[PDB]
Amino acid sequence: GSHMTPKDDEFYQQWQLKYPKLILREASSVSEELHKEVQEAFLTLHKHGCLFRDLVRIQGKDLLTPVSRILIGNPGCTYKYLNTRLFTVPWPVKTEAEIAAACETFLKLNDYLQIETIQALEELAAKEKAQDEVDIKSRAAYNVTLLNFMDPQKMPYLKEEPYFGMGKMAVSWHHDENLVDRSAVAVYSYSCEGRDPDIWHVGFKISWDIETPGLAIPLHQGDCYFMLDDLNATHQHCVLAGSQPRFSSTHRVAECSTGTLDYILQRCQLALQNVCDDVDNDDVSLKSFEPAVLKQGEEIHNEVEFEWLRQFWFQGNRYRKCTDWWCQPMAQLEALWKKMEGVTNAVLHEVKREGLPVEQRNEILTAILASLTARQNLRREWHARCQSRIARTLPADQKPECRPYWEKDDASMPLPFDLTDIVSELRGQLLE
């Protein structure tokens, strides 16, 4: 395996022939004014300590990213990757005043990249020919940006690129996941100061394929590249380290149909439709015990707890150093989750009620047991993930908080944190 760079004569015809959906707009093609405002916003957020390495899971392993990151985008939006959900520090679409000015900048950067993306996609459809405009507009409607930083001088040893001799990797071969289908990706690259080892490169290869030589594109200060259409799906990309530190801003159309605050709040209101709601107290009484309704309730119970609450607090309130935006949302989701704990408790009581014909009972058990089985298995993995050896080495203001967590004697919670006792009883009844 080999790789092509601008020094190779075949590079330009390999790009033109087999990467027409990869666009490169060099720093000369965007306003100088913008350059300073964006690069100052990078340095500002870095100086304020807003960028964090993420505690991430790959194939059962807990690892921190080589890159320090922050997610900026629409209020209430989330982006999930490698089992970690990032919550946006929001930008001012229709928080300290300095940090808010950097988010405003990256929304301005977002607006410009959106325009450049629509134009590039309109040109490619023209060459393809030589409605669909609704598709182009939505595949360019970036709703988040994931900022990145890495100082390669701080790493003791970087992985060599394993297939084409591209040298040191900062980020390994991967796809950007959980994007809207065939949506574009726009990256602003900011370097602070065979292929050249000192200059940063983005690498590209065809999925499954290490025989076709891969492209290594140099990225100078303020260069922008665009992955269009299905490029992100059909190709892998990586980041090859240079000598200097580098920032990047990767603008994406996150697929957030189950990943906005509005969505999860409405799911919670849907679960609580089965609850008598005159007054918020400890005696939760349900309106229906139809198995489908209960199943839906316990499934929403698991979604808010694990996809939202435990994801959020696993990051140890790292958003505090940037925004307060999620503090009230997160306290309200926890109060709704608390009511659902009372729902589960209520259901448990009904299964124990003398005078419940066993086949009405067995229909109830068959509808909820998968959810509570999943609830305990995921609680063990989240409790372990919060107390792994790699997680205790973190600072005290980024340490993972395993929340919600209560002790076996806490009288405010109607059910214990560990449900194996409970779980094992219900399947005992279902076969007896």
Ligand X SMILES: O=C(O)c1ccccc1Nc1c(Cl)cc(-c2ccncc2)cc1Cl
Ligand Y SMILES: O=C(O)CCC(=O)C(=O)O
Binding site feature residues for Fe cation: 174, 176, 237
Point out the residue whose Cβ comes nearest to ligand X: 172
Nearer to ligand Y by Cβ, of 54 and 341: the residue is 54
- What is the residue type of 381? E
Annotated binding site for substrate: 69, 81, 174-177
- Distances, alpha carbon 320 to alpha carbons 95, 185, 236, 327, in Å: 9, 28, 34, 9
333 counts as binding ligand Y under rule CB under 6 A = no
390 counts as binding ligand X under rule CB under 6 A = no
How far apart are the C-alpha atoms of 136 and 116, rounded to whole Å?
A: 12
Strand partners, 248: 148, 189
- Give the one residue of 172, 244, 317, 429 binding ligand X; rule: CB under 6 A: 172
Please give the structure tokens belonging to residue 411.
Answer: 């009288």
224 counts as binding ligand Y under rule CB under 6 A = no
160 counts as binding ligand X under rule CB under 6 A = no
Annotated binding site for 2-oxoglutarate: 148, 225, 246-248, 250, 252
- Give the one residue of 171, 186, 254, 322 binding ligand Y; rule: CB under 6 A: 171
Please give the structure tokens belonging to residue 10.
Answer: 């075949």
With CB under 5 to 8 Å by kind, the binding choice for 109 among ligand X, ligand Y, none is none
Nearer to ligand X by Cβ, of 64 and 272: the residue is 64
Query: Using CA of residue 97, residue 108, residue 77, residue 233, what is the dihedral sign?
Result: negative
Tokens 């940006």, residue located = 145
Q: Are the beta carbons of 219 and 201 closer than 8 angstroms?
A: yes
Strand partners, 214: 3
How far apart are the C-alpha atoms of 232 and 228, rounded to whole Å?
A: 7
How far apart are the C-alpha atoms of 278 and 32, rounded to whole Å?
A: 59
Nearer to ligand X by Cβ, of 172 and 212: the residue is 172
185 counts as binding ligand X under rule CB under 6 A = no
- The mark string for 246-265 relative to ligand Y (x by CB under 6 A, - otherwise) is --x-x---------------
Nearer to ligand X by Cβ, of 109 and 238: the residue is 238
Please give the structure tokens belonging to residue 393.
Answer: 């080495």
Nearer to ligand Y by Cβ, of 248 and 315: the residue is 248
- Give the one residue of 26, 43, 82, 320 binding ligand X; rule: CB under 6 A: 82
Nearer to ligand Y by Cβ, of 52 and 313: the residue is 52
User: How many binding residues for ligand Y (CB under 6 A)?
Assistant: 8
Strand partners, 204: 215, 237
- What is the residue type of 141? A
- The mark string for 34-73 relative to ligand X (x by CB under 6 A, - otherwise) is ----------------------x------x-xxx------
How far apart are the C-alpha atoms of 326 and 312, rounded to whole Å?
A: 9
Element (H, E) at 315: none
Q: Interface with ligand Y by CB under 6 A: which residues?
A: 146, 148, 171, 187, 202, 239, 248, 250
